[PDB]
PDB file of C-alpha atoms in Angstrom:
ATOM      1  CA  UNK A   1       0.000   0.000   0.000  1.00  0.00           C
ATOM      2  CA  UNK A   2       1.168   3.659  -0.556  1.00  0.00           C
ATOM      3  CA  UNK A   3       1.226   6.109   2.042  1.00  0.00           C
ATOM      4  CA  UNK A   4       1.760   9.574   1.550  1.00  0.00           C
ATOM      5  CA  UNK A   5       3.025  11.438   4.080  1.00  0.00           C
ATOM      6  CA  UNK A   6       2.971  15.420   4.006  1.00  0.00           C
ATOM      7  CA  UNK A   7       4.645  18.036   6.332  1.00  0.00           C
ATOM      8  CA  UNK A   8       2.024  20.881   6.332  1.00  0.00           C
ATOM      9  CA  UNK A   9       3.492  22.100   9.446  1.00  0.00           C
ATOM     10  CA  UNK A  10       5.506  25.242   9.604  1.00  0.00           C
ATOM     11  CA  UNK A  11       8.426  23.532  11.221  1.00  0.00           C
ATOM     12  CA  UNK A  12      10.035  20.734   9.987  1.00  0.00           C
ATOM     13  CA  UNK A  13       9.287  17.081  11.567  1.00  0.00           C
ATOM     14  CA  UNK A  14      10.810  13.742  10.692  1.00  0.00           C
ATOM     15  CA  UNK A  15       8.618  11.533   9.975  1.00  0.00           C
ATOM     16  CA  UNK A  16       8.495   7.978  11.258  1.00  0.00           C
ATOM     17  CA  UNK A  17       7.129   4.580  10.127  1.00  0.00           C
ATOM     18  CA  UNK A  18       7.626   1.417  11.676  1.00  0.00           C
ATOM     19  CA  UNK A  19       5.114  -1.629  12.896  1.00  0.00           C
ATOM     20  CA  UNK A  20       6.891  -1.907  16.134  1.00  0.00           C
ATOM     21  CA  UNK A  21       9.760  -4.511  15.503  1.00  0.00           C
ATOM     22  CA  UNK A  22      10.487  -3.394  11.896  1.00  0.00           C
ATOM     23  CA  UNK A  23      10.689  -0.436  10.110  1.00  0.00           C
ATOM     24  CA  UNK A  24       7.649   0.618   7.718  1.00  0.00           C
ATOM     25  CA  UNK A  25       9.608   2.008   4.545  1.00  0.00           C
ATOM     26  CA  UNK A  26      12.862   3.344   5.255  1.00  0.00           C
ATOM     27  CA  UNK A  27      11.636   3.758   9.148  1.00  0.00           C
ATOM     28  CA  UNK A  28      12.043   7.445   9.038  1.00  0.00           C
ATOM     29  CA  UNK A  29      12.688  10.731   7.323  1.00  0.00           C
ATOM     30  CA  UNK A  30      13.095  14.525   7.775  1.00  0.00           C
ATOM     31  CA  UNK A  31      10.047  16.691   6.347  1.00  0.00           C
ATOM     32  CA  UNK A  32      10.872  19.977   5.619  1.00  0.00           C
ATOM     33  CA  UNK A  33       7.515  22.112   5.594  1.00  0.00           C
ATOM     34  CA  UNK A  34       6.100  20.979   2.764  1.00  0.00           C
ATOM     35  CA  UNK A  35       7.819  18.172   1.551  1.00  0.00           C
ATOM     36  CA  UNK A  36       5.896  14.992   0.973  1.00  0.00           C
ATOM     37  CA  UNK A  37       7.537  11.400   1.529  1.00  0.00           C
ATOM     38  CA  UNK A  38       5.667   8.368   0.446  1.00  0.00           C
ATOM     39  CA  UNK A  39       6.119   5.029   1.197  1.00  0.00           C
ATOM     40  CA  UNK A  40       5.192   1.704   0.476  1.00  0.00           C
ATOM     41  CA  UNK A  41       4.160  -0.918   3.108  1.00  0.00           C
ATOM     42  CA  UNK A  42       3.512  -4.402   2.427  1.00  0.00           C
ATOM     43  CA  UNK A  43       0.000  -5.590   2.583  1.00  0.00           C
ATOM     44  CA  UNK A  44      -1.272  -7.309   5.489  1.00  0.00           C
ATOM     45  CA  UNK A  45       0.944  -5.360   7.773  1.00  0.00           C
ATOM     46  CA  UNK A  46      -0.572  -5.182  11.101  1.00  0.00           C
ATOM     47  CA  UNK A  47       0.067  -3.006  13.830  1.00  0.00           C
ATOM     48  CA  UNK A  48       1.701  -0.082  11.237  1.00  0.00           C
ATOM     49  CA  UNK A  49       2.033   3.252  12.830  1.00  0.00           C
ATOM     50  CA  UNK A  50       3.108   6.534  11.834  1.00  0.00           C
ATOM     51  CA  UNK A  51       4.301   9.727  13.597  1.00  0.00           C
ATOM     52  CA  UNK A  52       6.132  13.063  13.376  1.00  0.00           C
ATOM     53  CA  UNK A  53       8.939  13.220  15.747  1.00  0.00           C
ATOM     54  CA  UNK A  54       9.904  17.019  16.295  1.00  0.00           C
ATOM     55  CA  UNK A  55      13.366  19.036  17.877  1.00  0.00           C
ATOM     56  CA  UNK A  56      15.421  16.383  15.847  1.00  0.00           C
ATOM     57  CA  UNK A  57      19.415  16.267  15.992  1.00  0.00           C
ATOM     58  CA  UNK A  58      21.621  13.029  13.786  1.00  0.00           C
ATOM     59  CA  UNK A  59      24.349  13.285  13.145  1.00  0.00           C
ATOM     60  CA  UNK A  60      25.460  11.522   9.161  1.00  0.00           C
ATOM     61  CA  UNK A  61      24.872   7.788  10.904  1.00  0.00           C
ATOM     62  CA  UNK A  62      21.485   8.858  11.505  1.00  0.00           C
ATOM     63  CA  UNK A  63      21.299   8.693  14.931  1.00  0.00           C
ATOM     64  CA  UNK A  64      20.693  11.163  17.338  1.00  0.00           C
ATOM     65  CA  UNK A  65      17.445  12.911  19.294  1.00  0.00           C
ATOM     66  CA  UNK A  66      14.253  13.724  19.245  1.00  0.00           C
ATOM     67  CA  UNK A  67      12.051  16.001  21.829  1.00  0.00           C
ATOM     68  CA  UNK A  68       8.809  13.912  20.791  1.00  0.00           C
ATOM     69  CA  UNK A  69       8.547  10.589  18.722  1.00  0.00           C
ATOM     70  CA  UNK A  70      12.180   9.229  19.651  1.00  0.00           C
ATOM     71  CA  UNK A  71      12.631   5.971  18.463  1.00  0.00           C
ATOM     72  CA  UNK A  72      15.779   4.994  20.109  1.00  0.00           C
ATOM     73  CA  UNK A  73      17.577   8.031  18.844  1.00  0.00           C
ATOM     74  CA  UNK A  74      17.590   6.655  15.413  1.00  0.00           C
ATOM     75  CA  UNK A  75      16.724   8.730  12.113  1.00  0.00           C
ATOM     76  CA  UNK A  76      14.918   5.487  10.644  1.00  0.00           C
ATOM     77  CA  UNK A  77      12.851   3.726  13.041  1.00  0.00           C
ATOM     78  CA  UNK A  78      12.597   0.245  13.507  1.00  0.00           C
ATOM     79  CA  UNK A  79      10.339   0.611  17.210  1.00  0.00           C
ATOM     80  CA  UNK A  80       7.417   2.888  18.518  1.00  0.00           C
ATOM     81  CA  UNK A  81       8.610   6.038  19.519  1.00  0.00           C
ATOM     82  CA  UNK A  82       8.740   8.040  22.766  1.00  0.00           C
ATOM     83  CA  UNK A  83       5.675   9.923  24.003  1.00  0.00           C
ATOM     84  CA  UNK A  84       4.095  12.107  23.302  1.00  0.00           C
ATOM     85  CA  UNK A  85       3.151  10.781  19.859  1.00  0.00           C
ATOM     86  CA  UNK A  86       0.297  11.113  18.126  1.00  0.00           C
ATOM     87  CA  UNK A  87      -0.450   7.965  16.335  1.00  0.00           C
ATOM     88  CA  UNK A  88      -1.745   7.551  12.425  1.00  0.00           C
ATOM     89  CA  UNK A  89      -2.355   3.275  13.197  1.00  0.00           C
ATOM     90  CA  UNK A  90      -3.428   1.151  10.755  1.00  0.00           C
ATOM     91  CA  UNK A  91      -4.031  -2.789   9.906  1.00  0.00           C
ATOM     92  CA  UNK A  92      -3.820  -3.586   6.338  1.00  0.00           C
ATOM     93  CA  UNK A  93      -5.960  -6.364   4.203  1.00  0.00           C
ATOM     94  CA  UNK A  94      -7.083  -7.465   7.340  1.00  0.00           C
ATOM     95  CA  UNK A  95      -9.819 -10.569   6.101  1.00  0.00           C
ATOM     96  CA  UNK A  96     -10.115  -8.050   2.985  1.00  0.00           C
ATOM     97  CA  UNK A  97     -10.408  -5.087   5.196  1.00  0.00           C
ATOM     98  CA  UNK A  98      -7.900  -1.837   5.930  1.00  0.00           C
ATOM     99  CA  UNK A  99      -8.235  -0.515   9.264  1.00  0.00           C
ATOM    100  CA  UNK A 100      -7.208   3.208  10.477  1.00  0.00           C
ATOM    101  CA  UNK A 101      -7.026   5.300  13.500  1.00  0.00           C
ATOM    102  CA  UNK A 102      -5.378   7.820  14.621  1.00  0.00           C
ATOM    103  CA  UNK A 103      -4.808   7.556  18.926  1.00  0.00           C
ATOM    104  CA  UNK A 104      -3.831   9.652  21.212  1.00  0.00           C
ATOM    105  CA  UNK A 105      -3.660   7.276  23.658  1.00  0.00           C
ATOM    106  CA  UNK A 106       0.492   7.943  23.398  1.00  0.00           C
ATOM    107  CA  UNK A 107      -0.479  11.724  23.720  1.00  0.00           C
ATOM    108  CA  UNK A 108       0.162  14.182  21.141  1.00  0.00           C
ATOM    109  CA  UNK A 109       2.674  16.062  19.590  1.00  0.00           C
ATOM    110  CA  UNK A 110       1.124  17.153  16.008  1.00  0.00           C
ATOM    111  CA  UNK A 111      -1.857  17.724  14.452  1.00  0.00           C
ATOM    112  CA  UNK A 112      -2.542  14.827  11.657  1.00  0.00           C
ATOM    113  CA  UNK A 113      -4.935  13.519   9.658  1.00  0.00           C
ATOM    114  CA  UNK A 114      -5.308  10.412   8.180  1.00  0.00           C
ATOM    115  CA  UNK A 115      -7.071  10.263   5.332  1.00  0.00           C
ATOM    116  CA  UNK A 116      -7.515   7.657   2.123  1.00  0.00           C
ATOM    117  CA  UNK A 117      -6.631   8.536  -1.112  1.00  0.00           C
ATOM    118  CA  UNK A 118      -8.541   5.697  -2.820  1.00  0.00           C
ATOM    119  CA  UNK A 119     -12.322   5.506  -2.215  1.00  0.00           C
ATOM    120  CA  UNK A 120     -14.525   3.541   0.294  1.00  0.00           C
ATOM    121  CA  UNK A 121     -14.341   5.045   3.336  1.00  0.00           C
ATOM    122  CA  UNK A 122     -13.690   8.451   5.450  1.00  0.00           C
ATOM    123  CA  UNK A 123     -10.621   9.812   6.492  1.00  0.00           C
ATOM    124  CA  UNK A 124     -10.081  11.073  10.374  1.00  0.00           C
ATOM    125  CA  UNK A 125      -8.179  13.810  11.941  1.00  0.00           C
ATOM    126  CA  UNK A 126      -7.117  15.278  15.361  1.00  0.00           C
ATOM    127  CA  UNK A 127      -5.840  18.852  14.680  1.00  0.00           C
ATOM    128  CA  UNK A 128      -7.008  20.757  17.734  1.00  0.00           C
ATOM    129  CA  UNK A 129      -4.534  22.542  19.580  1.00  0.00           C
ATOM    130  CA  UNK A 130      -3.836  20.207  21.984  1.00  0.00           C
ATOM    131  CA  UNK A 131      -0.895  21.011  23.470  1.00  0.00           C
ATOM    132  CA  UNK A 132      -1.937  24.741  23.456  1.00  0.00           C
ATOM    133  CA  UNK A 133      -4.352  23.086  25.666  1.00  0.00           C
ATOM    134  CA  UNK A 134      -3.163  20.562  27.768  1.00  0.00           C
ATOM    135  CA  UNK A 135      -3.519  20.516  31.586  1.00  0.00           C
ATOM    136  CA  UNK A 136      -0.705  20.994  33.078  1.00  0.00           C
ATOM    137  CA  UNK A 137       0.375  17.906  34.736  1.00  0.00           C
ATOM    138  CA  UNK A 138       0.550  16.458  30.924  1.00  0.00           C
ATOM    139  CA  UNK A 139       2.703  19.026  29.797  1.00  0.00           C
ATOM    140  CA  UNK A 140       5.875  17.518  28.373  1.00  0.00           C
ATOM    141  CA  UNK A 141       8.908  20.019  28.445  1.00  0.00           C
ATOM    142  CA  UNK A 142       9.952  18.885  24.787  1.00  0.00           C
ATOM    143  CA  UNK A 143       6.206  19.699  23.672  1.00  0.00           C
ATOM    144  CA  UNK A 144       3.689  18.143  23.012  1.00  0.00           C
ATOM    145  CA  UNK A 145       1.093  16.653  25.801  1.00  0.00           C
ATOM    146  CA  UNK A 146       1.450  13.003  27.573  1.00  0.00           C
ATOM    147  CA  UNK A 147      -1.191  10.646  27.600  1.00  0.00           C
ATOM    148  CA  UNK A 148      -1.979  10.286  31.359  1.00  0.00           C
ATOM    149  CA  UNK A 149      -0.353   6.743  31.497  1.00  0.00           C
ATOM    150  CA  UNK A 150       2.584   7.715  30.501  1.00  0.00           C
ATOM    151  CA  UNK A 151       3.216  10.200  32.907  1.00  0.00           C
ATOM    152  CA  UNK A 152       1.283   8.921  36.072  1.00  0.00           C
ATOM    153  CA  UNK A 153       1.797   5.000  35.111  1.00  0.00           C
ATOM    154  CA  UNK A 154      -1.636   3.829  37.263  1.00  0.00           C
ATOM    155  CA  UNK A 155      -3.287   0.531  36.641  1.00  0.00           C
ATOM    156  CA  UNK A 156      -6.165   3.212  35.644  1.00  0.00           C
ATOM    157  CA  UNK A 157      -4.693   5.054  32.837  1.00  0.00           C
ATOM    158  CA  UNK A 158      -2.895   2.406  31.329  1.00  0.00           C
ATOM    159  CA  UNK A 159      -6.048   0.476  31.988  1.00  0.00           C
ATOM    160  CA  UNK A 160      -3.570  -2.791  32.578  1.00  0.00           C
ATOM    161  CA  UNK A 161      -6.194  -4.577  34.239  1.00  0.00           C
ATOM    162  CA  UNK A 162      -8.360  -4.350  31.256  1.00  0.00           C
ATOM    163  CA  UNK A 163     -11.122  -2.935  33.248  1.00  0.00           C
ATOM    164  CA  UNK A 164     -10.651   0.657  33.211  1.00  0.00           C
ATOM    165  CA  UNK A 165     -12.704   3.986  32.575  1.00  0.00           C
ATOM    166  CA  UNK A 166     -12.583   7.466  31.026  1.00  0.00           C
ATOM    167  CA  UNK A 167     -10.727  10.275  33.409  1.00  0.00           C
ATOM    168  CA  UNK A 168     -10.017  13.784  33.319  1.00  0.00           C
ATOM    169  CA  UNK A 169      -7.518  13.026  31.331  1.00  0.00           C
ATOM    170  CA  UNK A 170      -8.370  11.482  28.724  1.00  0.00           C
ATOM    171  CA  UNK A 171     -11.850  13.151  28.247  1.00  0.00           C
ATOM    172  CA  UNK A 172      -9.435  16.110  27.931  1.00  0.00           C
ATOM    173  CA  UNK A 173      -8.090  14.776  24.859  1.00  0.00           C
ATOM    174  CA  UNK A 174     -11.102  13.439  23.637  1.00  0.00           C
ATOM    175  CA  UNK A 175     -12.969  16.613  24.007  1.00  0.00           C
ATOM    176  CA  UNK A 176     -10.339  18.385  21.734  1.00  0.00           C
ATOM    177  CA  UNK A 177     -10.247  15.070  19.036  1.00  0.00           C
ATOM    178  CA  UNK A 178     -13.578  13.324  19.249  1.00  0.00           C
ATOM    179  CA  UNK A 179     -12.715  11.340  16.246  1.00  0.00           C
ATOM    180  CA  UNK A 180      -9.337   9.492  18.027  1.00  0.00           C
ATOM    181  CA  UNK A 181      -8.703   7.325  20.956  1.00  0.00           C
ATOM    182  CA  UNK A 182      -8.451   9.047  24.553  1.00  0.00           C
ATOM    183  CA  UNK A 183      -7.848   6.183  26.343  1.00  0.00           C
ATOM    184  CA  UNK A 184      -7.511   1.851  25.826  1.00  0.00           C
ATOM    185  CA  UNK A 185     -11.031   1.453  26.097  1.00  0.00           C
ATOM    186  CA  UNK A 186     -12.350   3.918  24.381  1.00  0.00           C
ATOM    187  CA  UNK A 187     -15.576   3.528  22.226  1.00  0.00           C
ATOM    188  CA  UNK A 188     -13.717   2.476  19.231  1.00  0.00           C
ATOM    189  CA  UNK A 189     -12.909   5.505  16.677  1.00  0.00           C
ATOM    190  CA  UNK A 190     -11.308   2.731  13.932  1.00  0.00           C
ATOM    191  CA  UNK A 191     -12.264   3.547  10.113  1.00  0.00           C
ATOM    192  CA  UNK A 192     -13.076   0.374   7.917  1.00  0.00           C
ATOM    193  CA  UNK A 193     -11.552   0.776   4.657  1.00  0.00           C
ATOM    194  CA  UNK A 194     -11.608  -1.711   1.676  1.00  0.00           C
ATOM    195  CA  UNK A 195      -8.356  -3.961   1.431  1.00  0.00           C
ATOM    196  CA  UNK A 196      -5.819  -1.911  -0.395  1.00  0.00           C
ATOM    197  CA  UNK A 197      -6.379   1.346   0.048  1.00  0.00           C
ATOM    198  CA  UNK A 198      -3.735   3.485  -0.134  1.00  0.00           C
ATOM    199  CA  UNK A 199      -3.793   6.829   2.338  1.00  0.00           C
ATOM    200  CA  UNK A 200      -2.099  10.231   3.070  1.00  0.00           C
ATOM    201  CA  UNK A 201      -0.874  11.056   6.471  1.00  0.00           C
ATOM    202  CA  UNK A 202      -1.033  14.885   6.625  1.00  0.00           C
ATOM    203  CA  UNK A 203       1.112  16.673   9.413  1.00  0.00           C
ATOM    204  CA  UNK A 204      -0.735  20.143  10.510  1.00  0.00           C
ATOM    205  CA  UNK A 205      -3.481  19.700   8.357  1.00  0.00           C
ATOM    206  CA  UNK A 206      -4.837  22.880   9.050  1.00  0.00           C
ATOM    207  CA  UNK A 207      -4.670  26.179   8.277  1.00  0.00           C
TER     208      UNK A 207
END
């Protein structure tokens, strides 16, 4: 599948794609406002995820660090990076069926939206100003606004138990992006899209 990923942000982010024990792609990339960086993932890759990562230093190895999104200081990722994040996830040709999200359940560092650019289904989007916004115990100094597990690591938040309800917290974020997930057991905000479809990931949507 092709994504296209776009840096409409003012500031330049590096872009990130992995599926957690493998980069997506070439794993990562700097985005100059502007600049657009597609990649191709296989099909059937489950558990893809991609993010901006901002206040990036590598040196020519292509390692270094990151304020938000850090994958283990490395320009291409190959893991999840560091909250805050927020997430663009997706499962592809899953039983003939592409499913997206985007999650703030890492927090959130960038506006995004995630949209198809084939046909059959909707696209979704979190581009409040969250971290404008966020309270201030989720304040991360780097930017960008933790997810409450993250910072306060309760059996709650993290809902570890697997029983586990909305807070404060993550109504705050869900309040700002109705259309992503606030917290693990969130009422589901995963889009259905036919097997195949191919998508744009757009940093800072907004104007």
């Amino acid at each position: 599948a092709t994504f296209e990923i776009v840096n409409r942000c003012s500031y330049t982010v590096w872009a990130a794609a992995s599926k957690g024990d493998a980069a997506l792609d070439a794993g990562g990339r700097q985005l100059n406002s502007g600049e657009s960086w597609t990649i191709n993932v296989e099909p059937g890759t489950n558990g893809g995820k991609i993010w901006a990562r901002t206040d990036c230093y590598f040196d020519d190895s292509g390692s270094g660090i990151c304020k938000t999104g850090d994958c283990g200081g490395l320009l291409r990722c190959k893991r999840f990076g560091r909250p805050p994040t927020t997430l663009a996830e997706f499962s592809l040709n899953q039983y003939g069926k592409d499913y997206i999200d985007i999650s703030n359940i890492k927090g959130f560092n960038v506006p995004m939206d995630f949209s198809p650019t084939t046909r059959g289904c909707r696209g979704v989007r979190c581009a409040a100003d969250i971290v404008g916004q966020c309270p201030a115990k989720l304040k991360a100094p780097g930017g960008g606004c933790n997810d409450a597990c993250t910072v306060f690591q309760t059996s709650e938040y993290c809902c570890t138990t697997g029983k586990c309800g909305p807070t404060e917290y993550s109504r705050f974020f869900k309040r700002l992006c109705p259309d992503a997930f606030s917290y693990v057991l969130d009422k589901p905000t995963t889009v259905t899209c036919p097997g195949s479809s191919n998508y744009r990931v757009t940093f800072c949507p907004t104007a």
